[PDB]
Design an enzyme around this catalytic site. Sequence first.
Site, PDB file in Angstrom:
ATOM      1  N   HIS A 125       0.790  -1.218   0.000  1.00  0.00           N
ATOM      2  CA  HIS A 125       0.000   0.000   0.000  1.00  0.00           C
ATOM      3  C   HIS A 125       0.827   1.276   0.000  1.00  0.00           C
ATOM      4  CE1 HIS A 125      -2.961   2.949   1.816  1.00  0.00           C
ATOM      5  NE2 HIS A 125      -3.624   2.461   0.782  1.00  0.00           N
ATOM      6  N   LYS A 127       3.150   4.393  -0.930  1.00  0.00           N
ATOM      7  CA  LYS A 127       3.367   5.206  -2.120  1.00  0.00           C
ATOM      8  C   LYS A 127       4.706   5.911  -1.951  1.00  0.00           C
ATOM      9  CE  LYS A 127      -1.328   5.293  -1.036  1.00  0.00           C
ATOM     10  NZ  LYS A 127      -1.643   3.976  -1.680  1.00  0.00           N
ATOM     11  N   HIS A 408      -8.651  11.572   1.236  1.00  0.00           N
ATOM     12  CA  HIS A 408      -7.790  10.410   1.099  1.00  0.00           C
ATOM     13  C   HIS A 408      -6.504  10.550   1.901  1.00  0.00           C
ATOM     14  CE1 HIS A 408      -5.373   7.283  -1.098  1.00  0.00           C
ATOM     15  NE2 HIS A 408      -6.530   6.657  -0.973  1.00  0.00           N
ATOM     16  N   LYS A 410      -3.712  10.818   4.963  1.00  0.00           N
ATOM     17  CA  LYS A 410      -3.384  10.001   6.132  1.00  0.00           C
ATOM     18  C   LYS A 410      -2.400  10.812   6.982  1.00  0.00           C
ATOM     19  CE  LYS A 410      -3.706   6.992   2.382  1.00  0.00           C
ATOM     20  NZ  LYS A 410      -5.193   6.879   2.445  1.00  0.00           N
TER      21      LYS A 410
END
Length: 574
Positions: A125, A127, A408, A410
């Site tokens: 997950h 990026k 989106h 975090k």
Amino acid sequence: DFLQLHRHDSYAPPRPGTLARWFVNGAGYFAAVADAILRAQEEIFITDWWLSPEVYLKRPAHSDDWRLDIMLKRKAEEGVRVSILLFKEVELGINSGYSKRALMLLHPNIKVMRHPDQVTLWAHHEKLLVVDQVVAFLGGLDLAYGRWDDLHYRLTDLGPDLSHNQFFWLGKDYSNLITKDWVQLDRPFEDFIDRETTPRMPWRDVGVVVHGLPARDLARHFIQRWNFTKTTKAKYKTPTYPYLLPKSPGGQCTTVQVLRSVDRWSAGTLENSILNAYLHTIRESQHFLYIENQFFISCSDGRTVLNKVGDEIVDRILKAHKQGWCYRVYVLLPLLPGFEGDISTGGGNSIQAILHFTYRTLCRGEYSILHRLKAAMGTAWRDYISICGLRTHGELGGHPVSELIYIHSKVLIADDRTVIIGSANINDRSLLGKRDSELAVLIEDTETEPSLMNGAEYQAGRFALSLRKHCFGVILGPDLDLRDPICDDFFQLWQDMAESNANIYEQIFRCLPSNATRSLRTLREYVAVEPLATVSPPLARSELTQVQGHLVHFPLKFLEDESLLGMIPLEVWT
């Protein structure tokens, strides 16, 4: 540096004197990524849960310049070695096979490995993009369709030879992942929703770039995963996929520590330092938390939900209430989860499953934050925690339209001094280590500037304060005093605006979720009513002038009369 674990049980130690710069939304992030790719001299490392080869890094496109695949191909033609790790989905519609084949075709110096090959619930997950092991980008943004956005959060994009192009989101990039999931990714420049009638969904996210030692630490995580993945199957064991080796503009000097979630399956070693840093940062906070996250699934029962982030928030608030100190928690969540579904008919089982565990953290059941706060302090919980989402409006077809702004991000901010930015959602999948692999950076300020904290003079950190004020300013929309983030006057102003905006949006658009639909029974009757937006566009426009910013209360009663939870393991949703 790597013979033994460090603070928060991380593989990497904190790095003082690190130049770091935050990004809100994809526009600045993707443009800085493009600039860094252009100056690469030796290596480019990339990890993505989803990589769209034809995505443009600067907008609007007028040529093949700034297209991701073209940029990587030219660097490879110059001799740069590009190494890419992509998540291999269960053919999900990300189509990693298409991405792999397209990238490998570009140039012999570009090498792509996909993982995992076994059937599993968990994914890669994180990026990441690292240039020459000295400049590293990370956060919540994949180099993928739908991610590019800016402060305008455009709901419409009305204005293959691109010389005359005026669209910001070409073809598959124009999307609303709640309206429809992506299809036919091998036709990148063809629309799959009606531009003239169907608004895109704005995408809000947070990224960061770090230089120097933490960028090398991030390169070491990539190298560890790369060399580990080589051993996973015969095709990757060959020198076609070379062993990788660690190489022993608006940025603020900070202390930065890299954190990660990895397991045997994902990297051949165990770590959950993102979770550790989250719990420590909340426990040691003194004034406030600002949390902007795609998911908020926490509060452990020891069986179905395991991570303790929500529990640390409860204990911290209870401690501040017991001692009589001013303390605020801001939680910013997407109003609906990012799954394809029709919310007017309940949203479907994927949306309802996430909604169940979201409300379980927030306010429903014995483990929820609000139930445990109410137990100790009754209605006073509203003094300590505010749960909100974001919404915007525009015009399409001659009348106002509205859509949520998809959070989106975090990110966590504490006390205007400490920031966590990464890929890790607040759920077990991201935080336990054993499940999805994730990355984050813990950014602590050493340089400060005079600010306010509940009316008292307060030395706030430069990186954290600039980011927090940018979030507050965009969310609240000139004469606003954003210096003090916890004083009574500001906290009341925040709650008043969230409630006022939510009420206006409900009056004009009858948008979901809403506290007006507590059952599927009442939802059925509710959605059969045409909203004022189309009944009387003039009357709707007049009322919409009273909206300020994007902040809306997160409706705590939506579908509260339903159960919301068949043979899929429950840990898929947490």
